[PDB]
Amino acid sequence: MAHHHHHHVDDDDKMGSKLWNLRNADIRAVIAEVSRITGKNFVIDPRVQGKVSIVSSTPLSSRELYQVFLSVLQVSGYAAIPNGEIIKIIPNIDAKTQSPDLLSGMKSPPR
């Protein structure tokens, strides 16, 4: 009615989607934080330990969020590698792919 100001950054204003401005917390807290909304399965390598804070533009949807999680890892020194239905987050600074010893096939000797 009167005193038309409204000059405060107090209003977060959830525009039908979740705003993401997190503060440096444990990486696995955030990997659970993202899976909480995304509904996705994650596999965290024991070497994945550090601080992560997802800060992004206006409210993010489930997929939108997950896309920023992929970026926050790259800043953190980690990466998410989808292993089928489960996504594995590992330290890309140490391991990006790491071809396993089970890459020799089946090896079927003729005799």
Side-chain angles (χ1 to χ4, degrees), residues 52-70:
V52 169
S53 43
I54 292 184
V55 289
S56 188
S57 45
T58 47
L60 299 172
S61 195
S62 183
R63 184 175 184 182
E64 299 296 295
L65 151 63
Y66 179 52
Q67 304 324 273
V68 185
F69 172 57
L70 306 180

Side-chain angles (χ1 to χ4, degrees), residues 21-35:
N21 189 144
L22 284 291
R23 297 296 172 179
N24 288 273
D26 177 80
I27 176 126
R28 297 111 82 236
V30 187
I31 305 175
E33 189 165 76
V34 55
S35 42

